[PDB]
């Protein structure tokens, strides 16, 4: 399986360049990743910055240096020669279509499979706004043509021995790692549903886009939204007879053994009673 693992320094290195040149509001900052991967698994650790500029009115305006930016990789080659160019990362807040046209220029200098990440200047979402792209030829059922498109894959943040405790040493404020972490994650799971519910509000706007003037309709999106009914809701009521019994067994074994282990603290009164007998010298 292809799983992109991103180092958090990539987000911090680009965050500095967003403040310096004041790059934001539909302005993409192009960058390149680094690592050694001969397998499908992609490991992203070090990253560079490409001085890219674009126009907001014209999405076809792009300028990228080929061998002038690779001097940073030549300087890093003498540092670490094990890692080479495995891909590249962009910003794309509105996801410009310039990356769809040419997949060759970025693949010429990267011998690995084509990979395109997303680093926004905002990245303030509680969810997982960081997304990965794989550019291949995929068959489309929309009825137009089969061409190179983006393939989405899940990614995450890398933690190694260097930066694991380094970030925790900087924060050292709110951690709270215990059995009580269920209330934080399950609430975030509810926020994940509410986060997708906010994405469903964009689906509400998707119909308004059809209501708008001269916009097409994507047939691929309709295929996924068509099965939302027959899948998973009074249809499941027939299976709720044997399903509720499985949830009750969890409560049966839990409540009988939960009141046992808590009865071993009786020694508190026993030790406190012996303290009064030790008061002869007190």
């Amino acid at each position: 399986h292809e799983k992109v693992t991103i180092a958090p320094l990539v987000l911090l290195s680009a965050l500095d360049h967003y403040e310096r040149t004041q790059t934001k509001e539909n302005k993409r900052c192009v960058g390149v990743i680094l690592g050694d991967a001969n397998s499908s698994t992609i490991r992203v650790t070090n990253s560079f910055a490409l001085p890219f500029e674009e126009d907001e009115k014209n999405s076809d305006v792009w300028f990228l240096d080929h061998n002038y930016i690779e001097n940073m990789n030549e300087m890093c080659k003498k540092i670490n020669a094990k890692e080479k160019l495995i891909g590249w990362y962009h910003s794309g807040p509105k996801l410009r279509a310039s990356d769809l046209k040419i997949n060759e220029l970025f693949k010429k200098y990267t011998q690995n499979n084509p990979l395109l990440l997303i680093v926004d200047v905002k990245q303030q979402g509680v969810g997982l706004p960081t997304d990965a792209y794989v550019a291949i030829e995929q068959v489309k059922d929309d009825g137009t043509s089969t061409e190179k498109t983006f393939l989405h894959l899940p990614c995450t943040i890398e933690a190694e021995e260097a930066e694991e405790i380094g970030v925790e040493h900087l924060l050292r404020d709110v951690r709270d790692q215990a059995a009580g972490g269920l209330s934080i994650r399950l609430t975030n799971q509810l926020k994940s549903l509410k986060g997708l519910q906010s994405k469903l509000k964009d689906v509400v706007e998707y119909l308004d886009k059809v209501i708008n003037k001269e916009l097409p309709i994507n047939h691929t999106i309709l295929g996924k939204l068509q099965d939302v009914f027959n899948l998973l809701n009074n249809l499941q009521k027939a299976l709720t007879v044997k399903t509720n019994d499985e949830l009750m067994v969890i409560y049966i074994s839990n409540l009988v053994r939960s009141i046992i282990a808590f009865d071993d603290l009786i020694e508190n009164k026993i030790q406190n009673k012996k303290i009064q007998e030790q008061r002869v010298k007190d």
């Binding site: 320094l9 940073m72 380094g166 925790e168």
Partner: protein, 284 residues
């Protein structure tokens, strides 16, 4: 006469990827930033030096490597002034290196604001950055006697033995500094939301419940099989009529035979509460 060292979060961890977990044969590099001497110190932009067979050498100090790096400063938009150099040494108790100071001496006359911050890749395993600094005399009483480290009380520098007590006589060649860390608003809550503990785990709805078919009965076997043994062992150990207290086995013998069994009952009760009930979020 006295200074204080402050290092941001971005400039904190770069080489320590190679230093800490990137095994020995350490590298060096340049630090950048802007500050005012004798009061505060700031480090922002950092990039390392190339690695050779002999490690730190003249080729790493040579500006031919930096010539192409300075061109990347204005292109990437990140550019500052030289605040010093950084190195690493495998935890030498006394006199880490005298070569890195010679590089500091030649670059001191052209800057005088340069600060040499070295970190131990060996003893940093605890997660705390080892604090050491080499600097030329600032406004000199150091040619004879002076006390570095503004707020001379501060906290005991620890370290080991030798160079701790050599501060007084060798102060000309050794200038002590207390290194502190700081981070801005975009470096505080922005990274915390994506890190916290372990990873951020995007799309929290992903769990192991979708993988549960035969493992549901396996969970029912773990809350029974291993639990039946904890019931008999708890009574078997308590049945002993010896007592006598004193020492005997009481360091921890009884935990596994008495108290850990209560925790072993809890270990299967934690995974029971882990998914708990109705983890499908209401619906049907």
């Amino acid at each position: 006469t006295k200074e204080t060292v402050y290092i941001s979060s971005i400039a904190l961890l770069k080489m320590l990827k190679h230093g800490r977990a990137g095994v020995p044969m350490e590298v060096m590099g340049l630090m950048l930033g802007e500050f005012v001497d004798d009061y505060t110190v700031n480090v922002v932009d950092v990039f390392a030096m190339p690695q050779s067979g002999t490690g730190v050498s003249v080729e790493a100090v040579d500006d031919v490597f930096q010539a192409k790096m300075m061109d990347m400063l204005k292109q990437t938009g990140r550019d500052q002034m030289v605040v010093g150099w950084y190195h690493s040494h495998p935890g030498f108790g006394c006199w880490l290196s005298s070569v890195d100071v010679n590089t500091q001496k030649s670059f001191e006359q052209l800057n005088s604001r340069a600060v040499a911050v070295v970190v131990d890749p060996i003893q940093s395993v605890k997660g705390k950055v080892v604090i050491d600094a080499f600097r030329l005399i600032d406004t000199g009483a150091l040619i004879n006697n002076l006390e570095p480290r503004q707020t001379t009380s501060n906290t005991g520098l620890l370290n080991k033995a030798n160079i701790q007590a050599l501060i007084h006589g060798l102060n000309r060649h050794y200038y002590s500094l207390n290194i502190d860390y700081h981070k801005t608003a975009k470096e505080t809550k922005m990274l915390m939301n994506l890190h916290k503990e372990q990873w951020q785990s995007g799309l929290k709805m992903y769990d192991y419940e979708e993988k549960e078919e035969s493992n549901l009965a396996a969970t029912k076997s773990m809350v029974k099989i291993a639990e039946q043994y904890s019931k008999r062992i708890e009574e078997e150990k308590e049945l002993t009529e010896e007592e006598l207290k004193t020492r005997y086995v009481g360091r921890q013998d009884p935990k596994k035979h008495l108290s850990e069994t209560a925790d072993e009952t809890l270990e299967n009760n934690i995974v029971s509460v882990l998914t708990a009930g109705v983890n499908s979020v209401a619906i049907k």
